[PDB]
Amino acid sequence: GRCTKSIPPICFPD
């Protein structure tokens, strides 16, 4: 579910 604070944001499978 998590997501990085970048763009495009890299979201984790969780």
From Swiss-Prot:
Entry comment on modification after translation: This is a cyclic peptide.
Site keyed Reactive bond: positions: 5-6
Cross-link (Cyclopeptide (Gly-Asp)): 1-14
Domain of life: Eukaryota
Statement: the UniProt record of this protein carries the keyword Signal: yes
Transmembrane segments: none
Alphabetically ordered keywords of this record: Disulfide bond, Protease inhibitor, Serine protease inhibitor, Signal
Bridged cysteine pairs (disulfide): 3-11
One GO term of the biological process aspect: negative regulation of endopeptidase activity
Protein's UniProt keywords contain Cell cycle: no
GO molecular function: endopeptidase inhibitor activity; protease binding; serine-type endopeptidase inhibitor activity
Protein role: Inhibits trypsin, cathepsin G, elastase, chymotrypsin and thrombin. Does not inhibit factor Xa.
Protein name, as recorded: Trypsin inhibitor 1
The gene coding this protein: sfti1
Interval of the full protein contained in this chain: 40 to 53 of 56
